[PDB]
Amino acid sequence: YFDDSVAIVGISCQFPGAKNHHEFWKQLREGKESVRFYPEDLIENPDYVPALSTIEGKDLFDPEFFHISPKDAEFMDPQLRLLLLHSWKAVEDAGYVSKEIPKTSVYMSASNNSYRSLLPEKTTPDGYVSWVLAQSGTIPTMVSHKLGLKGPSYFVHSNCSSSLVGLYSAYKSITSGESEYALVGGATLHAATSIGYVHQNGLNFSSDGHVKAFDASADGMAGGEGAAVILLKKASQAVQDGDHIYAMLRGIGLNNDGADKVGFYAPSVKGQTDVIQHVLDSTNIHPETISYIEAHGTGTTLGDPIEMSALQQVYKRYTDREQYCGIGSVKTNIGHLDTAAGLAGCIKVAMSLYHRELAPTINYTSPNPNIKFSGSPFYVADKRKTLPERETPHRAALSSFGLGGTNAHAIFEQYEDGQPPYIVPLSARNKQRLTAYASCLSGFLDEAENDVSLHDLAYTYQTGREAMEERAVFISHDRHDLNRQLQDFINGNDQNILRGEKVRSREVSAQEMETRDEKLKALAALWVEGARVDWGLLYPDSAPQRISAPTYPFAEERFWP
Amino acid sequence: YFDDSVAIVGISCQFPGAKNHHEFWKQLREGKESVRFYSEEELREAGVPEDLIENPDYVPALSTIEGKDLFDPEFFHISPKDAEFMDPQLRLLLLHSWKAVEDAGYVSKEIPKTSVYMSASNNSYRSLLPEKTTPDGYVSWVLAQSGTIPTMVSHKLGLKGPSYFVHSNCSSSLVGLYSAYKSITSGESEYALVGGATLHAATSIGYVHQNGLNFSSDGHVKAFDASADGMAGGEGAAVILLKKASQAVQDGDHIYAMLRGIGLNNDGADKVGFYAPSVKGQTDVIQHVLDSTNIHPETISYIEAHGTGTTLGDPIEMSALQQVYKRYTDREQYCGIGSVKTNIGHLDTAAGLAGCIKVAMSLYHRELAPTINYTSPNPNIKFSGSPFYVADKRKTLPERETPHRAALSSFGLGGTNAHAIFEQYEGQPPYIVPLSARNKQRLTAYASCLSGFLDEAENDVSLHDLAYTYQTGREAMEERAVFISHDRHDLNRQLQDFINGNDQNILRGEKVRSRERDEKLKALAALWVEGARVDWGLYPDSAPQRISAPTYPFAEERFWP
């Protein structure tokens, strides 16, 4: 059933308002808009829109982790830096040690932000190195080189639809057997902080800084900045391996509008129609089984009606059922993230399916009077909605239509205990980082909305994280005790915690192999001194499951010209 | 047989020394180096700093094309203001895309099922624009985004296949070629355009040779030679058109060569550093391409190497080829090795296409062109007793039963490797040549190009095929002239009359608007010059063939900040 499917097994993102994807999903469920509203000419201009949707810490990085010099880190634009960080995290989110999954392709997209222009005129050996680090192919290749990945690795771009070209490239590589996994990343991070813009005739930008998708009041888009990477995997293999799967990608297609439209910057109903139709034909998925569509959904006066006209024209070929499929756009929450737009949409879809719930689209009061929702398949999904139990898995589609005419549509599908004590091995590159890890893990235990399985959590840190030089092991019976020990560690009250410094890895010996509580303590002590223990020994008759958990706590050092 | 093959049917290039691919092949066959070296005089004019001139390590070399700044925006209905916002890579790849389709004998709007893949450098062109400029800020930003290149091509040519930018540093063109191969062999598109261009946004004569750059001590690329001590750059642009192989054959296209298979990988972590080469990565990609094609290495007559002339890279390249081919054969000295970088330098994103075009034209002309700057083998490489010889002479490819095959390698900085295998593929007067262009000045230029071609062609030119190419392989435009001729010398005389203003004997049309045996020919001609869409299907009992012929003579207007 899953031969033509790919599993989404890891996510890492950093979007306006949200430091990670779990916080992102929370903010989407709650209807939160993360656009922020606040030089004399501009201040006084009645058409200046005082709005910015960005992430923080574009300048922060941990070059030492990757053996990058401080000088070279400064030569690196923020998109390169954050896509590397997020690639590392996406694999850890999935519960894999990157160097243990070499059969992984890498596809990345980012903006031309002119970062290298910021460097000193004299600078621009430095001239050549900084030029190389500015070339777009350096992004995915740097990921491959630093993570240990050997599949095809390259940059892809189609303006707004870029993320979806990344996703298409992953789909193709994995379904063909070229690779087992793929990383897909997108980031549009400007090399300046420029608050607001001036609303004017020659531009289809919102009059008030809000994206009002599908609304009567929709008068233009607004941009936002962020970074995201996801890890995909051959579906049958993910199921076999017991991975934590957010959702399945069942198919995806691309086209270009060509000449058949009035102008280079215009939208095209015909191009949208045809790519939707192409994806229905390749997947053979019937439009009656789609419960939700994450639209391109930019909130332009001409684009929103065009988008719905294309969907209605195609679905009419298949059905007359009414009001069964919701429509929304994450651009309402965080703006149009350019190269990352398609991945913001994808991550919304995947989390909706994972949580069996739709999140609302926002800034909506009344339907655009040019759009006829009534009596069509579609309603505007302006509330939370539980996805009902039913026999067919729920499916959700996603659109992204780029400036220049390259269109993409994709269809996704929903996919659906030990005994204490539990051993949580943490490690990082140095003591400061390790302490930060404990602090991350503690915050996670406190902030998680639901109870957290220590069986699964421990197994994730055992088998899903690279063992580094600074080590600590926490043996605990329950979450509150584990948190107490983490807080003791954070505070320097270290006395009863197994610790290792400058640890060097080694193969277990025959001698080392020569009660269950005693044995657990012993494995832990071997690991903290560097022995590559077989954590499988903990689980003769339990079956832990890798879960989404805090990922490496990178240093936050500033590099900027 | 050809199910897994793609035909190369059109080429357009502009490389150091060569204004087109025919001149390029001539120059290769003759062993010409097109790197320019500057005297002290020459450096002073062109105004290079006397402190560079006096530096004993300054290398006074440049391998570039001319006229990076020249474009014809009116042809594409681009405003002069927007033309200035366009970087030269975007401009030249558009021009060369138009030309490649004409080189193939197709009217671009008649081949909508065409994918588009482009690669180019980050040259910081937008940074050159005024600060006030940077609606202009947004439009120039859009035009600076990499996805605009292929999508501008799709839009302006009328193409509706997937369209996007790809990049993997020096191997980029081969990622483009791979994407074309996959799109066509899967049935996604019938055709594809593949382009590459690295054009810097400055003219910077020479460089300073120094430790910690792997750049030639004297500006020559000395591939495989004992004196090889580093690479040297060049700039250029190229686009080719590929087509489903069986359909190219069925349509009677002019086929330069077939592409039989191609593959990609990344070196990953298994090497000492980001910027280093990798014998393992190369070995593995070559092996992958042999296994996917099932082509035996004894049938390969020539390899166009990545061939950069670095002290460590050249031996690594041969070690990988030797290690793979050893597993198949003990035969000796049957396969040549060479590198076009010896002629024109390392063309970065266009390096792979320069190699492809050399291979294609070698196969088409059944001859190998020499690799240059080669006296004596690198003593770390053992050619003796291996399959390989350095192809430092012209060589005729003998008649044999198995078609000749030639492979191509491109190994990017950041570790994305590509390898491809290519294979050789083998009416009565008067004639009517209907020429048309956008205005009278372009039409005159067209006549002049056509006349020059007739004079410069090394062999006799079939008027039967030439006329058919202009009839059926060129968009009929508003300024029209028809030349009815019995032979090449008369045709040339009429073209020269036209060029000189003596056009009273030539049927002409101005501001023509399209609308729905000797006697009959004259009648078609008069209809066509007034805009009637005549059926050139003149050919009840002859079968003309489309050929490579002069393409649209774009205006050469300067746009530069």
CATH of the domain at A165: 3.40.47.10
Among the partner-chain residues B154, B172, B210, the one whose CB lies closest to the CB of A137 is B172
CB contact under 8 A, A259 and B212: no
Q: Assess if residue A255 is contained within a domain.
A: yes
Taking the CA of residue B487 and the nearest CA in chain A, the distance in Å comes to 39
In whole angstroms, what is the distance from residue A379 CA to residue A363 CA? 15
Residues of A in contact with B287 (CB under 8 A): none
- Give yes or no: residues B407 and B526 share one domain: no
Domain membership flag for residue B99: yes
- B182 and B37 in a single domain? The answer is yes
B141 and B63 share one domain: yes
What b-and-e string marks burial along A159-173, b requiring 16 or more CB atoms within 10 Å of the CB?
bbbbbbbbbbbbbbb
Per the CB < 8 Å rule, is B164 touching A116? Answer: no
Q: Across-strand partners of B243?
A: B7, B191
Q: Verify whether the Cβ–Cβ distance B122 to A99 is below 8 Å.
A: no
- Report how many Cβ contacts below 8 Å link chain A to chain B: 202
Rounded-to-integer distance, Cα A256 and Cα A268, Å: 10
Minimal CA separation from A47 to chain B, in Å? 14
Burial of B545 (0-12, 13-18, 19+ CB in 10 A): middle
Work out the minimum CA distance from B49 to partner chain A, whole angstroms: 14
- Same domain, yes or no, for A457 and A360? no
Among B426, B446, B471, the domain-final residue is: B426
List CB contacts (< 8 A) between B146 and chain A: 112, 136, 155, 157
Distance CA B149, CA B239 (A): 12
- Chain A residues with CB inside 8 Å of B51's CB? none
Search chain A and give the residue with CA nearest B153. Answer: A258
Test B155 with A257 for CB contact under 8 angstroms. Answer: yes
A contact test, residue of B274, B283, B284 with most A CBs within 10 A:
B274
Q: How far apart are CA A219 and CA A212, in angstroms?
A: 8
B501 lies in some domain: yes
Measure A346 CA to nearest chain B CA, in Å.
20
Looking at the domain assignment, is residue B559 inside a domain? no
Task: Identify the domain boundary among B377, B405, B426.
Answer: B426
CB-based burial of residue A1 (10 Å sphere; 0-12 exposed, 13-18 middle, 19+ buried)? exposed
DSSP letters for B275-291: T---HHHHHHHHHHHHH
Measure A137 CA to nearest chain B CA, in Å. Answer: 4
CB B147 within 8 A of CB A162: yes
| DSSP conformation class of A331 | H
Q: Are residues A320 and A446 in the same domain?
A: no
The structure was resolved to a resolution in Å of 1.8
Distance between CA atoms of residues A394 and A415, nearest Å: 9
Residues B503 and B388 in one domain: no
Interchain pair B109, A257: CB under 8 A: no
End-to-end CA distance of chain B: 52
Bond prior to A377 in cis (omega within 30° of 0): no
Long-range contacts of A446-455 (CB under 8 A, 24+ apart): A446/A483, A449/A26, A451/A479, A452/A479, A452/A547, A453/A417, A453/A545, A453/A547, A454/A420, A454/A422, A454/A424, A454/A478, A454/A479, A454/A482, A455/A417, A455/A418, A455/A422, A455/A542, A455/A544
B285-324 burial, b if ≥16 CB within 10 A, otherwise e? bbbbbbeebebebbebbbbbbbbbbbeebbbbbbbbbbeb
Chain A positions in Cβ-Cβ contact with residue B157 (cut-off 8 Å) = 258-259
CA distances from B173 to A24, A403, B195 (A): 38, 23, 7
Does residue B561 form part of some domain? no
Q: Which residues of A are tagged catalytic?
A: 160, 296, 336
Domain that holds residue A26: 1-417
- Asked, for residue A560, whether it belongs to a domain, the answer is no
CA distance A289 to A251: 14
Of B124, B163, B166, the CB nearest to A256: B163
A16 preceded by a cis bond (ω within 30 of 0): no
Residue of A nearest to B267 (CA): A150
Do residue A142 and residue B166 have CB atoms under 8 angstroms apart? no
Using a CB-CB cut-off of 8 Å, the residues of chain B touching A142 are 274, 414
Last residue of a domain, one of B394, B426, B458: B426
SS3 annotation, A190-252: CCCCCCCEECCCCCCECCCCCCCCCECCCCCECECCEEEEEEEEEHHHHHHHCCCCCEEEEEE
Number of domains in chain B: 2
Are residues B197 and B102 part of one domain? yes
Q: Do A264 and B152 touch (CB under 8 A)?
A: yes
Q: Are A442 and A383 contained in the same domain?
A: no
- Do B99 and B123 reside in the same domain of the chain? yes
Q: What is the DSSP letter of A506?
A: B
Put simply, the answer to whether A145 touches B412 (Cβ < 8 Å) is: no
d(CA A358, CA A347): 12
Q: Looking at beta carbons, which residues of chain A come within 8 Å of B167?
A: 135-137, 154-155, 157
B91 in a domain, yes or no? yes
Q: How far is A232 from chain B (nearest CA, A)?
A: 18
Experimental method: X-ray
- Is the same domain home to A393 and A472? no
Of B151, B156, B268, the CB nearest to A158: B151
Chain B residues with CB-CB distance to A271 below 8 A? 160
**Which of A141, A150, A406 is the closest to B162 by Cβ?**
A406
d(CA B253, CA B240): 14
Contact B147 A117 (CB under 8 A): no
Let me know whether A454 and A405 are in one domain. Answer: no
Which chain B residues have a beta carbon less than 8 Å from that of A125?
A: 210, 212-213
Residue A259 domain flag: yes
Q: Domain check: are B475 and B388 in the same one?
A: no
Cβ pair A138:B169 closer than 8 A: yes
CA separation for the pair B257, B425 (Å, rounded) = 6
